[PDB]
């Protein structure tokens, strides 16, 4: 509630040299933003040095602090600290309270220093993904024609594996491929629960694909549409999406889309992988007629960012739901990034409700600001069961 009402009152700025923001960066031992030096007393419950006086901020190593996007987020996410303390004072047994922002930075309370190279991203965590969208029925289409052989084939293999890391146990996935003929890459032949074991099989099978043949989008898409209409096995009965990993071409396949989803019940997301001189117009067209998105992955450095942005599209019907979408969800048991043992995390999305009095903009209000989250350790639950 406080994050929603504070963001609306925020006035977007463009300079910060005069008005420096004060915050504690977790990953540290700069004009435009002042840093803090906390006391860091030792405390129980947590197994590290903490400071109950302010909230730390984690910014990913590939996200530049001091940008206009980051600095503006660092300003309006300062009233959260006065709510962080009120929750901790009311419940002294409160563990990490965090705000995973869609910008990329995570603000958590109490402040503690961050834990080789740091690859942590808040937008890829299971507790963030489960609150950013509803369960899905992903079905990955992989172009294994001859034209993708070489560098753009090992980018496709990496991208598909990196995409499978964004699926929880509530989502059902399957991977297919097509070169003048559509077939599965593994032994599954239908949507599977996409748990740890099932995803490892798909990751092993994706790495063993070879690029050779003539591309045929009509047979690849007919196979995908016929696998999303099974209804003979266990499914999610929710978001039905097709992710197409290809390079380019001239075929639009409008007759397949006009036959299988005339009412547009299935979203199509298209990816253009690698550096090439093939046409991208048909690729972008499939992503606009079907309510999806078009993504570009030109190198190995763009794989991580572009394989997690489809959750922004999937969250559009969730924002328009209203307060019905504000349901607290609990994740599976996992190990905390800041070493604390086995924990489960609550979850609540945050909506952009600026200009809600007039209801006139609705241009960037279809996306979520971020996901709220509070950690509950398994030792806390074990204490309630003597």
């Amino acid at each position: 509630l406080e994050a929603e009402k504070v963001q609306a009152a925020h006035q977007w700025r463009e300079d910060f040299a005069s008005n420096e923001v004060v915050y504690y960066n977790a990953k540290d031992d700069e004009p435009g933003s002042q840093r803090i030096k906390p006391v860091f007393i030792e405390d129980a419950n947590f197994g590290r040095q903490i400071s109950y006086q302010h909230a730390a901020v984690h910014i990913p190593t590939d996200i530049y602090e001091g940008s206009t996007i980051v600095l503006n987020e660092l300003n309006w996410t300062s009233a959260l600290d006065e709510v962080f303390k009120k929750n901790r004072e009311e419940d002294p047994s409160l563990l990490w309270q965090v705000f995973g922002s869609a910008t990329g930075l995570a603000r958590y309370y109490p402040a503690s220093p961050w834990v080789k190279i740091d690859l942590y991203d808040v937008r890829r965590r299971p507790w963030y993904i489960q609150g950013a969208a509803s369960p899905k029925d992903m079905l990955i289409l992989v172009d294994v024609s001859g034209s993708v052989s070489g560098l753009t084939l090992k980018l496709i293999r990496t991208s598909v594996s990196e995409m499978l890391e964004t699926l929880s146990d509530d989502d059902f996935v399957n991977v297919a491929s097509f070169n003048s003929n559509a077939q599965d890459v593994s032994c599954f032949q239908h949507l599977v629960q996409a748990n740890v074991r099932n995803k490892k099989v798909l990751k092993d099978a994706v790495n063993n694909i070879t690029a050779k043949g003539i591309t045929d989008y009509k047979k690849g898409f007919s196979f995908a549409f016929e696998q999303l209409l099974n209804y003979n096995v266990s499914r999610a009965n929710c978001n039905k999406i097709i992710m197409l990993f290809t390079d380019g071409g001239e075929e639009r396949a409008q007759e397949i889309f006009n036959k299988y989803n005339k009412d547009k019940k299935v979203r199509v997301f298209t990816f253009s992988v690698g550096q090439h001189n093939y046409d991208r117009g048909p690729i972008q067209w499939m992503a606009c007629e079907n309510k999806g998105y078009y993504y570009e992955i030109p190198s190995i450095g763009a794989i991580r960012i572009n394989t997690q942005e489809y959750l922004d599209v999937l969250g559009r019907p969730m924002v328009l739901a209203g307060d019905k979408a504000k349901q607290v969800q609990w994740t599976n048991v996992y190990l905390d990034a800041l070493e604390l043992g086995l924990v489960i995390t609550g979850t609540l999305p945050v909506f952009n409700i600026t200009g809600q009095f007039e209801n006139k903009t609705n241009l960037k209000n279809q996306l979520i600001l971020g996901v709220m989250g509070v950690d509950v350790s398994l030792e806390d639950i074990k204490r309630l069961t003597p």
């Binding site: 929710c238 991208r280 606009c288 309510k291 998105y293 078009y294 559009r316 969730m318 279809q366």
Partner: peptide, 23 residues
């Protein structure tokens, strides 16, 4: 047993912002 909630195919959704219209 899967979740009982489901949020998709909203009529009010804009969906006019893909990644190819801009470029």
């Amino acid at each position: 047993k899967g979740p009982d909630v489901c949020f998709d195919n909203n009529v009010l959704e804009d969906y006019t912002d893909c990644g190819g219209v801009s470029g």
